[PDB]
Amino acid sequence: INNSFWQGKRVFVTGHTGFKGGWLSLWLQTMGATVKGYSLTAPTVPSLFETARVADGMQSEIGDIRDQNKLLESIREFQPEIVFHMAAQPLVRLSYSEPVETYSTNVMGTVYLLEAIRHVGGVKAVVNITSDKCYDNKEWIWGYRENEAMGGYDPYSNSKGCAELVTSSYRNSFFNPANYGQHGTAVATVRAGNVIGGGDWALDRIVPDILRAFEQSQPVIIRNPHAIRPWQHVLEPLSGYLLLAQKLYTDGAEYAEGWNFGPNDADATPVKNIVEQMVKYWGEGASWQLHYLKLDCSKAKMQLGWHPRWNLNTTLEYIVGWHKNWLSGTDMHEYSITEINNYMNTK
Amino acid sequence: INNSFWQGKRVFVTGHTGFKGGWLSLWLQTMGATVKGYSLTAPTVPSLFETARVADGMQSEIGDIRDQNKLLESIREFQPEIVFHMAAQPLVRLSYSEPVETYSTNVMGTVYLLEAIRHVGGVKAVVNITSDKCYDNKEWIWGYRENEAMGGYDPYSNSKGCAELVTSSYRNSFFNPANYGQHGTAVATVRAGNVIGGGDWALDRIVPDILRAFEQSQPVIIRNPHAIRPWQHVLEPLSGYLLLAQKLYTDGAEYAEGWNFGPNDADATPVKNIVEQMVKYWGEGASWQHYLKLDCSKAKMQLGWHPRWNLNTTLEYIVGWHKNWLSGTDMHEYSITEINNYMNTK
Amino acid sequence: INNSFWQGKRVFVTGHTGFKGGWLSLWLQTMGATVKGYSLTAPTVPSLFETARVADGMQSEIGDIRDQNKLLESIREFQPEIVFHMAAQPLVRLSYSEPVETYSTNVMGTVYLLEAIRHVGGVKAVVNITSDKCYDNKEWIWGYRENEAMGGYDPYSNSKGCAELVTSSYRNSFFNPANYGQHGTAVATVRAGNVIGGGDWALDRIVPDILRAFEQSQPVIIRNPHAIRPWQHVLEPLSGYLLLAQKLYTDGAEYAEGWNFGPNDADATPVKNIVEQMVKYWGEGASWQLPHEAHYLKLDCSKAKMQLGWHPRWNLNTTLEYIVGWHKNWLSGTDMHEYSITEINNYMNTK
Amino acid sequence: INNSFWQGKRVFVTGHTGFKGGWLSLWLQTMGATVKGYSLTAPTVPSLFETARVADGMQSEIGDIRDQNKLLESIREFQPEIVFHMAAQPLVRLSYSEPVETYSTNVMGTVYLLEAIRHVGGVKAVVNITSDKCYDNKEWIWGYRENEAMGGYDPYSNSKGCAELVTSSYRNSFFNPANYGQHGTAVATVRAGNVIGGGDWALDRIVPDILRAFEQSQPVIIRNPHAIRPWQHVLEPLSGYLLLAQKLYTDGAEYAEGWNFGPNDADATPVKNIVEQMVKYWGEGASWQLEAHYLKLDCSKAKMQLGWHPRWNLNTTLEYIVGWHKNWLSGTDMHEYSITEINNYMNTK
Ligand SMILES: NC(=O)c1ccc[n+]([C@@H]2O[C@H](COP(=O)([O-])OP(=O)(O)OC[C@H]3O[C@@H](n4cnc5c(N)ncnc54)[C@H](O)[C@@H]3O)[C@@H](O)[C@H]2O)c1
Ligand SMILES: NC(=O)c1ccc[n+]([C@@H]2O[C@H](COP(=O)([O-])OP(=O)(O)OC[C@H]3O[C@@H](n4cnc5c(N)ncnc54)[C@H](O)[C@@H]3O)[C@@H](O)[C@H]2O)c1
Ligand SMILES: NC(=O)c1ccc[n+]([C@@H]2O[C@H](COP(=O)([O-])OP(=O)(O)OC[C@H]3O[C@@H](n4cnc5c(N)ncnc54)[C@H](O)[C@@H]3O)[C@@H](O)[C@H]2O)c1
Ligand SMILES: NC(=O)c1ccc[n+]([C@@H]2O[C@H](COP(=O)([O-])OP(=O)(O)OC[C@H]3O[C@@H](n4cnc5c(N)ncnc54)[C@H](O)[C@@H]3O)[C@@H](O)[C@H]2O)c1
């Protein structure tokens, strides 16, 4: 991550009012980038957006990505050189009760974003965040490789598989490598999941639910204790997104493809483990009661020189620290900035 | 194809004002089905819709499939037991010019249709027409199998790949074969391409262009003489769609998957040959100056489906249909007889 | 198939005393090629080898392909420009009772043949006959494509999958396309199955057994009347082998890969129908008396069609008519050497 | 790995005179197994076989696995319950000049072994060592999964792909999990590569050559400083082989398939760093002079179904390599030293 590269860059971020978007926006701000965000009002209360004062250091616009023209104008007005598309209906459970809204937001929203970029021009790098769930689920023990089939069982997962197809076609049709000397836009998709960190209040997700139980000194009710997942601190995939954006900007079409970001497998553990480790780090008032989808990230490692930095223990520790600070009244804007620095200064 | 099965069935057809939709609607009408169509105004002039008087024997509604509520009510008002979704922005060329409209129409339109079916209830069989182009193109000599990856280069092809994904998720989430005893809806997708026949006036389409030249007693100049495409008369895939619909209705979820329909590879012919045959079929006033394919073993083995007309026969009927159109023949009755001739084959 | 091309070509054929090998040898002879065969004594009595006088118009050597040096010498002595490797333990049933012999014959036999070719030099085209059974069986309704995985359940099928691997490695290591300008050898494998025709006296094979029944005016007993197999007249895949050989010779490494040869699936006919058609072609003295399979092994032959311009010539009915004809002429005492030559001519002249 | 399980077990090991075979034989001996080996004379001088006195505590037979009858009689005489097939022509380079012998040894040798087992009867577990190179090489960045295509460019790699096919057919035809209740034989294949450790004197091998230079106090000349290979101490895959053998014996056909064993990719290190660490570990007298992918395996199956996992990172492994070699040079009893190394491994985590 080259701080000097980000200084002064005009970066447009959809979904800046969310969990991942907030951390990314804060990170970009600390590196001196000129950032503009486009999202609906923060999805939860509390929210990282408000607690870490994400809006104060950037141009923040509230809008629906399904509003094709409003989005077009937002990008035209800003003239970004780099775009991170993170806005989406991210909940599986909810996708079952609101499938239409999930497809319109995740598929058409992506179409409208790419169309805006196509017409506005000048965008050098586009990083479209889809999901680790975009892959046709084979229900096997192996991590998915980027060249495998897109799909998805539930509307959310499937809409992300569709978003991947959309990005592929837009790239081939309007941002083709052979014509890169003309349009100059390098478009890529990034696939990652099981993101955890301080500031995520999407309760239905395990970690946020755990932290809420702990704060109330009430036992957290674990659904599937034996469920194994590849947990990773939110800054891990984000570091990959930033690294990729840099390569897309400076090197070009060579990196305009799909990319997996995830933790080392030897790190993955069952939810039972996560909770137990967290209980220890938290201390008093912490208790509980009662194959797997993963990605092969050899491509990011071999072609981007990417690698995670924090093991699960370090990650869970930072989580407890962040949440306890928030509860204690600490300035979470500065605290979050320091967390980014700690990550950045970890080698 | 049980002529008796279709009698009285309430069939809803999106895209009934188009080429394939018109032939399907006419076919359903001749078999005694109660048909309702939902489409935008016929895409061309002339059109099979008007020339073959498709609307006469059915309920015809003009509406946009992107209008979620209008579609919902149209289906609720009709209470169909069988649905054929054929409405879509079908042009590759146009998709490069209007990518957004292509995705909204082909992807969201399919989403709105399935959502309507989900809420209205009572639908027993759903046949969603996607495209032979829904497959991620490996650009090889082999015909694609139904279990291979979805994708698509251009917005049109890609939107069809997306439509396949959408249908798969809706089926798994809301019309799961495991819960068939509850919802009773068998949902499938059908993949076919290179459809030709009398009554198609889409521009830039090879066959229609050849006829456009003939009717103008002007020589047609071909640009790709060696190009091979698995051409098939429009009634060939439609017969497969009807056969599948019957199976979905009577047998159920066992057939709720994706299905390829296409001609036998041995029937594969280059355009130069196609032009020659057509010139010979037309007569005076006619002159001139790997490839994507599908493996249809599944339709054959599980549906007992199989093509009926070789390319020659198809080209002959194409010329017959068109020359008759120019001659002032009643194309509604002529088209009905064509369907009967097809049904009689074998 | 260019008859002119074969005139004077030195062709070495292993398995010339067998069913497919005999028809191929006879075909090569009629086109003026100088042929030498290397096989064990004909596998059955009667045999096409003896009934059609296969040896009379060629050099016929009896030897085991598992005898590395004897095979090397037989080849070095002959200096062939074209080689067709058809010798193998071809029975699945037997492979269960003699797995070791199956592997030694099909795998090491192929290794010894390729090694001999490597050292003798001068060979321009090598066509190694493996089997339609070389593919890892996915138990599905689709025809296999040449780029799919090799394997095999039983020792025979598996040994053929191994023969494919062996040929691939020998080509990559010693007959690499990148070095064609030096060695000049174009090596390929051909995959085909369900071959039928006059002159096959293998045991427990439906067509031959049907003829044996007709032969003794005994009703032919049928077990699974619904059984389907992509049957093809022996000359169909052989025409493909010859076409490929010519291309390997004249064009080179461009064709040094694996190739599928089979009939059109539209030709797929169950056994009951087959028996019925043969009963009709046979006439007086023919009759017949009585688990289902969801799928049957088949091949996708788009590659041969597109890249070689290959195409089958006879539907099953036509083929069955020729089968019955060949048999009764044999039974009547007809000169089967000349009869078989005419059959080859009829095939070449078809269309 | 259950020491009590191995006590008294009759284990037959082909290739016991080699590098991997010697360590495995020593390991089996320390756990109380009754071991018999069948190999050609040790391939090198020096050899682990002689230096670590591998033959002392076992029945050692010298024979060619291409001698179908001799191998048959060797197995019949011993009546093993567990068999580890490690004998093979393991060199890629040699396979180019001797392809026939490579195929005869690796393919027919495997056929003869399985045929012997088929007829002798009583064998409960068979672990056939093939190679990480049995996979059709796509030349990509991803680790191969057990369900992917067999193949191989060179005769050695290809012969291992063939050995996999042979084992699959023999299992399906004669040791089918469907009638395990009859034959009682659970047959599996194990795929692993880039094995390093004390006692390997194979020629033209990076680690052994580094030690050859160090032992002569001469700089080692490095020609491929950036080359990366999933190096692993010899005891790592062997622990997997032993664990699998136990499961095949006790649980049965459920484990009669192919299995990958390798190090974690996060452990991937280029030869330059390897030479550096080794120079540091050796000390006085050690010195050196100066593609976008590499063949690797996905070992999720071994992890998930066998509960297997690597125990030593590369650094720990290199330290033990240097230690083993320096002790050998110092006149240390390498039989006891090697036994202790096995114990150290068993004690890890
Ligand atoms: N957190 C994870 O574990 C995980 C796993 C896979 C994928 N993702 C993806 O990462 C992105 C960020 O997810 P997150 O965890 O921060 O979720 P989040 O809910 O905290 O953030 C989602 C953002 O999307 C915006 N948004 C949603 N619908 C919108 C619409 N119609 N118009 C405009 N903005 C809209 C929201 O306002 C919000 O800022 C999403 O694309 C999500 O699918 C997250
Ligand atoms: N004809 C072919 O060769 C071929 C090949 C592949 C796929 N298809 C598919 O078959 C179907 C029929 O194609 P066709 O050749 O008859 O084309 P067509 O253009 O003649 O018919 C298209 C129909 O779609 C309807 N439609 C389009 N957009 C609509 C919208 N927004 N709202 C409502 N109705 C709308 C039109 O009114 C028309 O009736 C399409 O789904 C097409 O993608 C056809
Ligand atoms: N006929 C089919 O339907 C079919 C299907 C797949 C593959 N094949 C393959 O085609 C080839 C020809 O089969 P076929 O039907 O003519 O069978 P066949 O039994 O009539 O001919 C086999 C030939 O192999 C020779 N042979 C066998 N073992 C030998 C050995 N050790 N040394 C030397 N020669 C030996 C025999 O002498 C004989 O000439 C074989 O490779 C067979 O596996 C045939
Ligand atoms: N060491 C590695 O990195 C690696 C990588 C892949 C595969 N392997 C496989 O692991 C096994 C052990 O290899 P290794 O490193 O110990 O090699 P090695 O050369 O040290 O041992 C090979 C053993 O094979 C025996 N052998 C060879 N040919 C024989 C024959 N014809 N008859 C009887 N015995 C014969 C030798 O006598 C020796 O004991 C082999 O199967 C090899 O292919 C090793």
Q: Would you list the DSSP string of B125-169?
A: EEEEE--GGGB----SSSPBPTTSPB--SSHHHHHHHHHHHHHHH
Are B266 and C265 a contacting pair at CB < 8 A? no
Residue closest by Cα to atom 24 of ligand 3: C87
The answer to whether B88 is a known ligand-binding residue is yes
What one-character-per-residue DSSP string does B46-77 give?
S-HHHHTT-GGGSEEEE--TT-HHHHHHHHHH
C63: phi then psi, degrees, rounded to nearest 5: -165, 160
| Residue numbers belonging to the annotated binding site of A for NAD(+) | 17-20, 40, 64-65, 86, 88, 160, 195, 205
The answer to whether C108 is a known ligand-binding residue is no
**Of the candidates D140, D157, D192, which is a domain's last residue?**
D192
Whole-number Å distance between alpha carbons of B308 and B232: 10
H/E segment holding residue C325: helix C316-332
Q: Among C149, C152, C154, select the one facing D149 at the smallest CB separation.
A: C149
Are B141 and C265 a contacting pair at CB < 8 A? no
Assign residue C44 a region: left if phi > 0, alpha if psi is -120 to 50, beta otherwise?
Answer: beta
Amino acid at D274: I
Note the ligand closest to the C-alpha atom of D295.
4
Residues B174 and B93 in one domain: yes
Q: How many angstroms from the chain centroid is the CA of residue A268?
A: 19
β-pairing, C125-129 vs C82-85, is parallel
Q: If you count them, how many residues does chain D have?
A: 349
Peptide bond into B177 cis (omega under 30): no
Contacts of B152 in chain A (CB under 8 A): 165, 168-169
Name the residue of C14, C19, C64 whose CB sits within 8 Å of the most ligand 3 atoms, as the mutation to test its pocket: C19
C331: phi then psi, degrees, rounded to nearest 5: -60, -35
Amino acid at D255: Y
Order of strands across the sheet that contains C59-62: C59-62, C34-39, C10-14, C82-85, C125-129, C186-191, C258-260
Note the ligand closest to the C-alpha atom of D152.
4
Using the mean position of ligand 1's atoms as its centre, give its distance from the Cα of residue A39 in Å: 9
Residues with CB under 6 A from ligand 3: C 15, 17-21, 39-40, 43, 64-66, 86-90, 105, 109, 129, 131-132, 193-195
Residue C88 tokens, joined: 């193998």
Taking CA–CA distances from C294, the nearest residue in chain B reads B301
Using the mean position of ligand 2's atoms as its centre, give its distance from the Cα of residue B241 in Å: 15
Measured CA distances, C23 to C16, C344, C351, D105 (Å): 8, 8, 20, 36
Q: Among B68, B136, B165, select the one facing A162 at the smallest CB separation.
A: B165
Residue closest by Cα to atom 24 of ligand 4: D87
Q: The CATH number of the domain where A255 resides is what?
A: 3.90.25.10
β partners of residue C84 = C13, C127
β partners of residue A233 = A196
Is-contact D27 D57, C-beta < 8 A?
no
Residues D312 and D324 in one domain: yes
Secondary structure E strands in chain D: 10-14, 34-39, 59-62, 82-85, 125-129, 186-191, 195-196, 220-221, 228-229, 232-233, 258-260, 269-270, 288-289
* Closest ligand 4 atom number to CA of residue D39: 34
Q: Among C143, C264, C306, select the one facing B266 at the smallest CB separation.
A: C264
Give, as one character, the DSSP assignment of residue C175.
S
**Of the candidates B168, B192, B216, which is a domain's last residue?**
B192
CA-based radius of gyration for chain B? 19
D266: phi then psi, degrees, rounded to nearest 5: -65, -10
β partners of residue A82 = A11, A125
What one-character-per-residue DSSP string does A55-68 give?
GGGSEEEE--TT-H
Residue C105 tokens, joined: 């014959």
Residues C70 and C143 in one domain: yes
Domain count, chain A: 2
Mark out chain B residues that contact chain C at CB-CB < 8 A: 141-143, 145, 264-266, 290, 295, 297-298, 300-302, 306
Are C158 and D165 a contacting pair at CB < 8 A? yes
D303 Cα to chain A: minimum distance (Å): 10
Are A162 and B157 a contacting pair at CB < 8 A? no
Residues A292 and A321 in one domain: yes
Residues A15 and A162 in one domain: yes
Using the mean position of ligand 4's atoms as its centre, give its distance from the Cα of residue D86 in Å: 6
Residues with CB under 6 A from ligand 2: B 15, 17-21, 39-40, 43, 64-66, 86-90, 105, 109, 129, 131-132, 193-195, 202
Q: How far apart are the first and last CA of chain A?
A: 12
Touching partners of D (3+ C-beta pairs < 8 Å): A, C
Residue entry with tokens 């590759």:
B92
Whole-number Å distance between alpha carbons of C256 and C168: 9
Are D165 and C166 a contacting pair at CB < 8 A? no
The overall longest dimension of chain C from CA atoms, in Å, is 62
D254 Cα to chain A: minimum distance (Å): 16
Residues D325 and D223 in one domain: yes
| Residue numbers belonging to the annotated binding site of A | 17-20, 40, 64-65, 86, 88, 160, 195, 205
Note the ligand closest to the C-alpha atom of B192.
2
Contacts of D100 in chain C (CB under 8 A): 68, 111-112, 115
C197: phi then psi, degrees, rounded to nearest 5: 165, 170
Residues A212 and A185 in one domain: no
Are C141 and B297 a contacting pair at CB < 8 A? yes
β partners of residue C233 = C196
Touching partners of C (3+ C-beta pairs < 8 Å): B, D
Q: Where are the alpha helices (DSSP H) in D291-333?
A: 300-301, 314-329
3-state secondary structure at position C307: helix
Is-contact A105 A89, C-beta < 8 A?
yes
H/E segment holding residue A129: strand A125-129
Residues B78 and B6 in one domain: yes
**Of the candidates A192, A209, A241, which is a domain's last residue?**
A192
Size of interface A-B (CB pairs under 8 A): 97
**Domain, as residue range, for B273:** 193-346
Count Cβ atoms within 10 A of the Cβ of residue D101 and give its class: 0-12 exposed, 13-18 middle, 19 or more buried: middle
* Closest ligand 4 atom number to CA of residue D41: 37
Are B103 and A157 a contacting pair at CB < 8 A? no
Residues A125 and A227 in one domain: no
Q: How far apart are the first and last CA of chain B?
A: 13
Q: The CATH number of the domain where D175 resides is what?
A: 3.40.50.720
Residue closest by Cα to atom 7 of ligand 1: A131
Q: Among D100, D115, D159, select the one facing C99 at the smallest CB separation.
A: D115
Using the mean position of ligand 1's atoms as its centre, give its distance from the Cα of residue A17 in Å: 9
Amino acid at B181: G
A106 Cα to chain B: minimum distance (Å): 11
Which of A338, A309, A308 has its CA nearest to residue A321?
Answer: A338
Peptide bond into A219 cis (omega under 30): no
Contacts of C311 in chain B (CB under 8 A): 266
Whole-number Å distance between alpha carbons of A77 and D263: 52
Are A142 and D264 a contacting pair at CB < 8 A? no
Residue A205 tokens, joined: 């997700």
Whole-number Å distance between alpha carbons of C348 and D79: 61
Residues D224 and D90 in one domain: no
Using the mean position of ligand 3's atoms as its centre, give its distance from the Cα of residue C156 in Å: 11
Residues A185 and A197 in one domain: no
H/E segment holding residue C244: helix C235-250
Residues D146 and D284 in one domain: no
Are A141 and D304 a contacting pair at CB < 8 A? yes
Whole-number Å distance between alpha carbons of C75 and D236: 48
Q: Rounded to the nearest 5 degrees, what angle is found at the Cα of D260, between the Cα atoms of D259 and D263?
A: 150
Q: Best of C164, C169, C173 to disrupt the D interface by mutation (most D CBs within 10 Å)?
A: C169
Is-contact A186 A126, C-beta < 8 A?
yes
Whole-number Å distance between alpha carbons of A36 and A16: 9
Contacts of D170 in chain C (CB under 8 A): 99, 155
Whether chain A lies against chain D with 3 or more Cβ pairs closer than 8 A is: yes
Is-contact C39 C64, C-beta < 8 A?
no
* Closest ligand 4 atom number to CA of residue D15: 39
Secondary structure tally for chain A: helices H, strands E: 15, 13
Residue C71 tokens, joined: 């095979």
Using the mean position of ligand 1's atoms as its centre, give its distance from the Cα of residue A47 in Å: 13
Is-contact C106 C162, C-beta < 8 A?
yes
